[PDB]
Symmetry: C3
């Protein structure tokens, strides 16, 4: 049968990629057309070669790709990159997660920024964009999940068609919560709750609501994994992020609103200090808490620390 032929199959990347894709700080490279295969490979090692029907999976992937836009940062490359970080987390904590969670989170990551225009929730609200009237909170993130559901509903795109209805609902819910958790405004409270549950020892992965929070922190960690690459990758990626933000700052000014320094290209010279603030207030606490909860994710924190040092070095003029 078809599932039988698919069971005999092997999927394989070039040698260097098979070796280094297991590393947390792996970079997926500049060859766009290699990215779908990289993702299929990760799905097959982490989930199994029979979790998805291959023809369907590829059809789904190319449609997701088609629904990312050509913006400097929140693009198709970002999606696959975030998916890779989740792959590495899953592979290094491989006894903790169910099959549904594995399938779900990899898919959630690939879809997490679908149809991103390169603008924040804040700008949409101030512009008075139609999405802001429809989604009062987590505006873009609820749109990404809506986009995800639209793609699944396309003919020949339901990659979960083999699941029972009960499992289907579960996986879609895993996906929904995970995408919503990528709204950074929700991170601060989430990490705060996790830290306190961790310290007192109430934190228990057998409790669904705790488990949801931990997955949420995982999504933040993957979403921000730019700060966990080696310095040359981290510093170049920063160019892409500010290209987007500065464009939003321009648009704020066009609405007659002074944008914050983060989004203001007139404040370029103060980027290094702005990054330092970001690492101190957001990234280091993020990966510190995640390392506490999932000790094998420690390389993310180490790498984050190294980049913090590099930015300090920039500030000094060193």
């Amino acid at each position: 049968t078809s599932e039988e032929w698919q069971g005999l199959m092997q999927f394989t990347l070039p040698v260097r990629l098979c070796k280094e894709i297991e590393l947390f700080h792996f970079d997926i490279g500049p060859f766009e057309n290699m990215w779908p295969g990289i993702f299929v490979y990760m799905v097959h090692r982490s989930c199994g070669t029979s979790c998805f029907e291959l023809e369907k999976l590829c059809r789904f992937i190319m449609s997701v790709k088609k629904n990312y836009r050509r913006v400097p940062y929140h693009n198709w490359k970002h999606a696959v990159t975030v998916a890779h970080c989740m792959y590495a987390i899953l592979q290094n904590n491989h006894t903790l997660f169910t099959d549904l969670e594995r399938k779900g989170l990899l898919i959630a990551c690939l879809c997490h920024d679908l149809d991103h225009r390169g603008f924040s929730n804040s700008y949409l609200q101030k512009f008075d964009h139609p999405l802001a009237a429809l989604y009062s909170t987590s505006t873009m993130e609820q749109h990404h999940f809506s986009q995800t559901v639209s793609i699944l509903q396309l003919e020949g795109h339901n990659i979960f068609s083999t699941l029972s209805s009960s499992e289907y609902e579960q996986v879609l819910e895993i996906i929904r919560k995970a995408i919503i958790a990528t709204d950074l405004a929700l991170y601060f409270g989430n990490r705060k709750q996790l830290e306190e549950m961790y310290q007192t020892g109430s934190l228990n992965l057998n409790n669904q609501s705790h488990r949801d929070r931990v997955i949420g922190l995982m999504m933040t960690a993957c979403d921000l994994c730019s700060v966990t690459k080696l310095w040359p990758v981290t510093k170049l990626t920063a160019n892409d992020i500010y290209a987007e933000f500065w464009a939003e700052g321009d648009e704020m000014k066009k609405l007659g609103i002074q944008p914050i320094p983060m989004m203001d290209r007139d404040k370029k010279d103060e980027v290094p200090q702005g990054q330092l603030g970001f690492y101190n207030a957001v990234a280091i606490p993020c990966y510190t808490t995640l390392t506490q909860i999932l000790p094998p994710t420690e390389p993310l924190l180490k790498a984050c620390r190294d980049n913090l040092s590099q930015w300090e070095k920039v500030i000094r003029g060193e």
Copy 2:
């Protein structure tokens, strides 16, 4: 019937946009896919919800969009922007214009730069482009009108199919004259004639040839409305204009011809003085004469004056 269903319909933008689209200095925003709806809205308020069949109008709009190119300034966004300025002029002088003129000028504005390559008539002539052999004067502008007619002639694209033949010819002529008037080389003589007719009192909107001239000056004013936005929008848009011109300067140099300072990127430092020259010699006289003729268009002149002050401030180093 269909026209009856269309008569019950309402079209509406978000709240902020409904309010501020009436302002002369409105910016249509960075969300491209909102622009067609903005244009339909303007057509419905200024012309009426029964002037066009909606399905046809949208088909026409998307084809026009498809025939603008991806250049930094003379693009789809410019077209809708010029259309908005005409909307605001029409709404604030609402007793003067016929239905045909209203329909026509909004359509003319949307189509005024169709298939623009980002090069002036001058460069085409020097390059010896095939369009220059076909159109000895107003080369690009006669091409834009030809493009307009080709799109109308497409199946299901004749948005004026409900007009009588006599009215159809009239509207196409209104459109033709209006697009040709956007050739800035023709502006100088036109404004000169209008000024003198205005001063002596011979100017009379009941005279078709005077009326054509006034519409022509209206088209110039809309075409240049960049200089009538608030400073943050005006100054950022200037980036886009020079990106185009400097590219043309590069191409002049490749033909072995020294380009004028306007088109020469080696003269960046002298942009502020170049703008000052432009406002003094072209923009201020343009909106001054237009305000004389159509007093409600005065906010364009005020805004132009404010930007003139801003450029003086740049020159001073202030």
Copy 3:
């Protein structure tokens, strides 16, 4: 018949282009949609109006165009530019080449960089790209020829369908050798052999292997013809080349490899000296040897010399 109608036909460019396209330093201009006609014109003057069936030729051209990518330098414009330099070489040495060679080399030039991603053979090897496993030497160049063959094999795309099988094989071999010769790593040995054969007088165009070498040097000369344009064109084109190389340098750094100064954007200030090195070590010897062998190609060498002077002038700060 159809070939008879095609025989009555004339193809013609605007006046300026008919005159200046015969010049070695001709620039094909910024109007993309003029480029196919320019190429057809060159084929018709150099080969004859009956060498190709026009409908087929155009179909082929647009498919080739479709298979070039949107990179800063190794793009569709580069392909037509390299084809033009071969045109000028062929027209000024018009008694030396067969019909097959003329057809072949113009086609080879148009296809020489098909599907170029903007990365060197070196980077592919270090990235461990699948093409590097398939093609151990001249990696990109064997890919360009493979792409060429795929396009020919498309229905209605075999522009050589009128040739006998024997002639078809010959032309494809001419094309294959010519594209492989564009691998610059092979140039150094090739020019070295040609120089020595030239000096001793063993060089003989009636010897197929010598003839192949001379064609190979011709391909290098066309491939590098950027350095043979007038200074304004040469200096602007240099921008495009470094945009590509610096991007590759970035990607080297992401692999953890320090790129050479040629590919490193941190070494911008040293570009003028880097060009000087390039002209001394590669370009001047290239066109010097070619001028020895084919004296009518002397204007390429003159122009190269003038650009060498310009770069020296840049270095001096003059």
